[PDB]
A = this chain, B = another copy of it.
Amino acid sequence: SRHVVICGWSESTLECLRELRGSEVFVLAEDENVRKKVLRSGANFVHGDPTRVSDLEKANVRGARAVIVDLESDSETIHCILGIRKIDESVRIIAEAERYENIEQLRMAGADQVISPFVISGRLMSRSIDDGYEAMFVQDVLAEESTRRMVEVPIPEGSKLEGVSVLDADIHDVTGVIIIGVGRGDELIIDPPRDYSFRAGDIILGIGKPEEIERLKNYISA
């Protein structure tokens, strides 16, 4: 599609940039000694301060399709998001919250998806005292190397599933995928109850083998 802009350089945006090989990525960071490791990862580098609007317009934030913001603290991640909202009001911003209490401020400044790593990791430790199958499930469906891949299929308009119930559909019996949640717009419903009825435009978040996913796109098609 279009290009992706990454403001700030940390260990989170490094691992993001491995799964973005084949897209056109511009990285915006203040330290000049990080120019080599960015250019090794297949991403163009732009030297500047990410909080400044004049250095943001270097990195093509206007036409971009997503802007991934991970600066050093949350004071600068909020200040960098509002600089982006001054340029383009409709671009999709994915922040990253260092502390827990700054998740609600980061949504008010304009971020469409706040991903806090230290709360996800902090809750996978205390759920792995007794038995650690929760921390093995989170770190195996996100990797693009395992056998079971967590995908998102949209329900087309003109589908055979418009208006049908879930128990009337029974998608795990026919396709082999596990419907862990159906989301509409900006909301996601984990474990949809039986009286939930599909609509065209909803997103079925599922887990399965890539053969079982190709059977699902035939089941929702016209």
Question: Which A positions have Cβ atoms within 8 angstroms of B?
Answer: 4, 10-20, 32-33, 51-54, 65-66, 68, 70, 73-76, 78-79, 82-83, 85-86, 92, 94, 96, 98-102, 104-105, 108-110, 112-113, 115-143, 146-148, 150, 152, 172, 176-181, 183, 186, 188, 190-191, 194, 203, 205, 207-209, 212
Q: Which of B12, B15, B123, B138 contacts A15 (CB 8 A)?
A: B123
A113 to chain B, nearest CB (A): 4
Interface residues of A, dominant DSSP = mixed
Q: Which of B11, B100, B112, B115 contacts A98 (CB 8 A)?
A: B11
Q: Which of B83, B105, B180 contacts A180 (CB 8 A)?
A: B180
A137 to chain B, nearest CB (A): 6
A86–B109 Cα gap in the complex (Å)?
A: 11
A188–B131 Cα gap in the complex (Å)?
A: 11
Q: Are B208 and A191 in contact (CB under 8 A)?
A: yes
Q: Are B115 and A117 in contact (CB under 8 A)?
A: no
